[PDB]
Design a protein around this ligand. Structure first.
Ligand SMILES: [Zn+2]
Ligand SMILES: [Zn+2]
Ligand SMILES: [Zn+2]
Ligand SMILES: [Zn+2]
Ligand SMILES: [Zn+2]
Lengths: 386, 382
């Protein structure tokens, strides 16, 4: 039963793992190998069965886990696609709503203009028709008087002449048309675009000044929305980390952590001030270095006209100063993009860029406002939360 | 017939303008006034009738003409309101069309990404399912072999082991959707500014007016200065002779227009508008008082506006030299604006004239000197 020697298979070669006969084991294929008979070789081979079963179970577990992960990824892909579609739809419907609102406002303005113009034209028509009726009556009276007897003519002619002179001196005023219809020019699209930039911003963040953190020389009135520096020399402050001691400034009660936020601060005619954000974990006392490495993103105006951005450098970076110092500053903060942008909000229709931070913000931060020293009275202008 | 003296009325008082009798004129009401007879007074009073009639006719004519004009305006009020509504609708429908197109494009991109990701993940799932099917078949083969006769066991165990080792050693080796952030609105806005412009005005260079040293190819949309010596030009006032430049065949007169010129890697060039009545030959002074509104780039990086002054006004030079310049011209507001059209997504402002332009003007392009060959880059109308 050797298939080559007609001898029954009775010897198992360990290193070849094949049944052979006695001739093959004595001389030939497996004469110098490690050879055993059935029993012990079979035992040694079945000893390896638990290892194979454990490896197979491990491989099956790994493959099933990978399949489950891929199915979870397919589900998350579907959810992500739906979320992206909905988010794009909402963000574009914002601008669509703005454009529809502008069109509606212009349409109601046109309705009012039509009504007023019609009323005014009807008034002028009534006035001129009454005046022309008076003219017609006077002309017919004159024509009838001109064909009267001598005495009646010479008695009524002067009365008729006086009446005619009176009605000719009582001419109706001109009463200019005044067609108050807003005419559109070619720049209408650009103006709408520049206003749409303002409508793109989020709602005005309702902030209130925190007196428990403000400098002792500052005072907060107008329901916590008007902070101003006092002209009194203040004693040194306490050992509180969250209260300013040398730099006269104040942070808001609200801490921003996530999303986008926008807020406007009115400085008016204040010659020296600063606005921005401060890290919540950074100490607020002592001499402060307005650098992002110390948790301070600030834009300042000094000497009444010099506008500086407090970027990470030895000295603040000078910026292109406008004709007049901006009277209202808008601040936009985006955590998802880590951007703090300062805009000139003096024009209610258009916001113009001042400076923007593009550095990765750790967060969360506090809105901080540095109302500087009153400087013997010429810096008593307050800071107002719009 | 005095009604007070029974004497007929025959004396007219000039300062009282009333007929009286002789008694009234001799003693009483009108004894010291200026008095005339009755018939002469009637003649003198009827002399004044034509003046009164003419004044009445003039006043009536004036008032009736004003009434007719006001009636026409009353009729036309509705037309004026309709015109304003339609103009506003068109100006806003521009942005509405842009937003609809952008939303459709984003939706198609998202659908394509979703389809590709689903196909790839299903392919990987099918591959792993086939691998697990192979594992199951091998496991069942092993379980069936483990209960075989002793000879069959000793002759198939090692083949099964080798196959299992092979299939275990040959295991298979194994987010790209753009999510929108808060700056998505601002990016859409900055892209919308470009679509706010009207259609690209199809202009073609005029060879009959260009300098003889220039050559116009690509169906009249690519003008370039050749490095070959050209013959002198003719004595035509509308053809450039010293300043190597070219104007377009089309003259803009009314409305708003926008056109883009590709300069590419050209170091020195100029673009703008020229008055149709200003002479084009000889040394030219690029000043608005002479019908020339030009923006130039020299030395590869210096950007200058040719405003009315002794020297051109230097402008903030960008990081890189602009590769495409867009020109917008509006007659209703008299504005010529130059924008950097290098980025197809966003246009950045360069300079804009806000002076009232008389018009009409020609789009003029100054492709500067060849400069011994290093200025042979062409100018292409996009
Ligand atoms: Zn044998
Ligand atoms: Zn052997
Ligand atoms: Zn608005
Ligand atoms: Zn009398
Ligand atoms: Zn008298």
């Amino acid at each position: 039963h050797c298939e080559e020697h007609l001898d029954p298979l009775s010897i198992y070669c360990e290193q070849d793992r094949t049944l052979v006969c006695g001739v093959c084991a004595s001389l030939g294929s497996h004469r110098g190998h490690r050879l055993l008979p059935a029993a012990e070789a079979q035992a040694r081979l079945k000893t390896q069965l638990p290892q194979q079963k454990m490896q197979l179970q491990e491989a099956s577990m790994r493959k099933e886990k990978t399949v489950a992960v891929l199915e979870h990824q397919l589900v998350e892909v579907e959810e992500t696609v739906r979320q992206f579609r909905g988010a794009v739809g909402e963000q574009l419907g914002k601008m669509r709503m703005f454009l529809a609102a502008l069109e509606s406002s212009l349409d109601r303005e046109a309705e009012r203009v039509r009504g007023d113009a019609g009323v005014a034209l009807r008034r002028e028509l009534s006035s001129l028709n009454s005046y022309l009726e008076q003219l017609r009556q006077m002309e017919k009276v004159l024509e009838e008087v001109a064909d009267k007897p001598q005495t009646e003519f010479l008695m009524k002619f002067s009365l008729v002449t006086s009446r005619l002179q009176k009605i000719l001196s009582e001419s109706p005023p001109p009463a200019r048309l005044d067609i108050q219809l807003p005419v559109i020019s070619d720049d209408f699209k650009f103006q709408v675009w520049k206003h749409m930039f303002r409508h793109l911003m989020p709602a005005l963040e309702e902030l209130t000044f925190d007196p428990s953190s403000a400098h002792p020389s500052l005072v907060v009135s107008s329901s916590g929305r008007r902070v101003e520096c006092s002209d009194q020399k203040a004693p040194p402050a306490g050992e509180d980390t969250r209260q300013f001691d040398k730099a006269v400034a104040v942070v808001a009660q609200q801490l921003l952590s996530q999303g986008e936020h926008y807020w406007e601060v009115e400085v008016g005619d204040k010659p020296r001030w600063a606005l921005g954000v401060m890290a919540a974990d950074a100490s607020r006392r002592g001499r402060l270095h307005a650098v992002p490495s110390q948790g301070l993103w600030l834009l300042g105006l000094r000497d009444g006209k010099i506008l500086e951005a407090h970027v990470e450098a030895k000295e603040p970076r000078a910026l292109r100063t406008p004709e007049r110092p901006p009277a209202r500053i808008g601040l936009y903060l985006s955590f998802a993009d880590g951007v703090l942008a300062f805009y000139d909000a003096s024009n209610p229709d258009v916001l113009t860029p001042i400076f923007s931070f593009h550095e990765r913000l750790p967060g969360p931060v506090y809105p901080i406002f540095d109302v500087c020293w009153h400087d013997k009275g010429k810096n008593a202008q307050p800071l107002l939360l719009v």
